[PDB]
Amino acid sequence: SSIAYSNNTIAIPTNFSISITTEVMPVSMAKTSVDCNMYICGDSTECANLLLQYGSFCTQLNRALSGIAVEQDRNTREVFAQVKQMYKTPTLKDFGGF
Amino acid sequence: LTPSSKRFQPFQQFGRDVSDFTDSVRDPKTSEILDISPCSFGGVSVITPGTNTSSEVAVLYQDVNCTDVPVAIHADQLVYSTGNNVFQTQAGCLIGAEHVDTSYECDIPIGAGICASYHTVKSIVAYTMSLGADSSIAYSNNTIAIPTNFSISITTEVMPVSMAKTSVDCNMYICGDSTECANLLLQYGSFCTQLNRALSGIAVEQDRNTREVFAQVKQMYKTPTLKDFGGFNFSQILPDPLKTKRSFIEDLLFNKVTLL
Amino acid sequence: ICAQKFNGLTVLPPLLTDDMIAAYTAALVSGTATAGWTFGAGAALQIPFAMQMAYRFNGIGVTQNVLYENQKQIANQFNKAISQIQESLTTTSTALGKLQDVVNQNAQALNTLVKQLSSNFGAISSVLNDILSRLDKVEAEVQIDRLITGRLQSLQTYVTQQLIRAAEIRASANLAATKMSECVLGQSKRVDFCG
Amino acid sequence: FAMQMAYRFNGIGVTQNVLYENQKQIANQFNKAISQIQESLTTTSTALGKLQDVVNQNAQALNTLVKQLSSNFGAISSVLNDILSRLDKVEAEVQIDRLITGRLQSLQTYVTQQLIRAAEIRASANLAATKMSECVLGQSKRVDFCGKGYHLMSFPQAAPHGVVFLHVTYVPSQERNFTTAPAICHEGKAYFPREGVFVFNGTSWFITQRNFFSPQIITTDNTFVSGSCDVVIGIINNTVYDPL
């Protein structure tokens, strides 16, 4: 672009336009949940007994997943639930030509 | 085991899926294809108002269409399975909770816009969530509402600023005091050295967080002796000289939070 | 999805259904159209839309006579821009590329987790049934341990990736909440924040 | 302080005469709100639910880490003493390796979770620093950033592992309906208001602020002319008093 600098000249607009732009923002992600035995073992009693010996690994995994899910619910609620009143939709939807 | 329509090759004896799960098998004596599914079936969730309050609970089956998928070969029914007080929640069947048309705030979320709570009637009640207080707004082309009075509202905002600084030891944790275990651990490299580096970074970051949040004034302005400024009583939020260095609200806040 | 269901992998439905979010957005738009910026700062005070737009023009250093003299042009530009965005959205486009990206990311993560079962992790086989039907208990312990360690590592990797993705999505959601507070419920003086 | 609050009122579109005339009411409301928050804090409340939440999170993480030692991780036992006293060196190497790998994995999981939590806490701390800069050391024009309503000032307070901000806000109330006009036609030219809006109490047309009903006579200093009366819709005929 060519920009000319002047010590005694200014450019001022004489008209204007209305521009509507879109901005897309992710707000939440899918809430997932997993099972200790059905994934690690399935339906095997012996595998379940063996897995018990590892302690509280999958318990903490479940805790993390639950935290993620409740966080997603909170994300959506805080982004959207910002009006305390559910204003009624007007039947007349033209407001001074808009 | 259940009958299946799966197409098996002439010689095939069993078949599995992408996750190497044997979802089909051939009967060696009758040569009929049988599908086999797990027993857990996934997704049972329990809704409890707290053992301290009551021992009554409700059961949500995530994707059942209110049927007996949890094969009924157990005494009792698992609270019940396909009883009378059944509600068909979007993506779920809920049993043990009473459905009420009136909608309230959410207490125990279930999903699909359905929440449950321990209301009195005392039992577990499920309902649809309440979005907000319905309001009537009148639009006029030649009228406006202007306020004629005002009020002063003081609101609180709590913000975590730092977390506890933790440090760990390589041998004291992994091994303890065993020389042989320490020698064996040396062969694993520099794992715990990098763990210590990460923990030190976290601790220094916490110190920096607190300092940057609070250390924004280069001058420690003196606390005024007169704590009334044109009728504004600041004595509740400023330290009391007689006491110790904290203000009353600060003392309340420290007391509120409980800090093998 | 059937394999995910048979391996304990499930998706919980969101708390707010699409209808409730649509109701929230309709309420917000109605409040903006009727009460203007005021409904976000306390009580909702009605104002004719022309006067609200005159105040919004004043907010950007333009006297209100401009709007009262060019109302027809401004309304026509508003409507034409709305129709343009409508058509832009309806013509196959990547406008919603972030949302589809997060959906695809979640689907791919679940698919990778479920497909990780096929790996035998250096054991005799990746299936417990054949290990238990071929090798006796004492010898089978080693194979079972190998498979359990591998599958636990897969679960931990999935959980860590989900945690980091959730942190990123929380950052985006906080930005969206701030944008709703500052652009929708009021007029924003920050440059390039609200468009 | 009176003049400081007068400037803060001016900052939200309210003339300073409002404060100088209602100083007693504003001070009383300030004190009543402070007492209300005091009593709110003293009554068992979840006000500090985030701070206690982070404390509980750290405690639970440490407890899980320490309890992870009881797991034998598929080895002969979870204790090194009995393994070393029962099995000779070469054979015991397998058990030692099993336990060491398990405990290293537990430590790595704990450290990764701590790193993610530290990132979240850093985000919160940066937000708190921005709030201190913009709400406490100044007046914020951002909506809902420094409390619901129109921001006047803020006061910080310490708390275990966090900061509590007391945001003072001006919320209008006691609404009144009025009939208004975009402009006023006078001698064939349209007068627009320099600030505020025209209103009609039922007797005559006045000019007032948007944020407070302070009716004032329509003059030439608070109104400016532009164009004619045939180009704006809603213009209503009336006279504009001239101080001369």
Author numbering:
A (entry chain B): 686 to 783
B (entry chain A): 539 to 616, 622 to 664, 673 to 794, 796 to 811, 832
C (entry chain B): 833 to 1027
D (entry chain A): 881 to 1124
Structure paper excerpt:
We performed cryo-electron microscopy (cryo-EM) studies to define the interactions made by residue 835 in the WT SHC014-CoV spike. Extracted particles were subjected to two-dimensional (2D) classification, which resulted in class averages populated with fully closed trimers, wherein all three RBDs are in the ‘down’ position. A 3.1-Å–resolution 3D reconstruction of the WT SHC014-CoV spike trimer was obtained and found to resemble that of the closed SARS-CoV-2 spike, which was expected given the ≈80% sequence identity between the proteins. The flexibility of the NTD led to poorly resolved regions of the map for this domain, preventing the modeling of some loops based on our reconstruction. C–terminal FPPR residues were resolved (residues 832–840), affording an examination of residue A835 and its local environment. A835 is part of an α-helix proximal to the FP, and it lies at the interface between protomers (buried surface area upon oligomerization: 22.7%). The A835 sidechain is pointed inward toward V946 in the S2 heptad repeat 1 (HR1) of the same protomer and toward residues D555, V556 and S557 in the S1 subdomain I (SD1) of the neighboring protomer. Residues 555–557 in SD1 connect A835 to the RBD in the neighboring protomer. We propose that the introduction of a negatively charged residue at position 835 decreases the stability of the spike trimer by disrupting a network of hydrophobic interactions within (A835–V963) and between protomers (A835–V556) and triggering unfavorable electrostatic interactions between protomers by virtue of its close proximity to an electronegative surface region in the neighboring protomer. In the WT spike, F294 is located near the C–terminus of the NTD, and is coordinated by contacts with K266 and K288 in the adjacent NTD-RBD linker to form a ‘double-cation-pi’ sandwich.
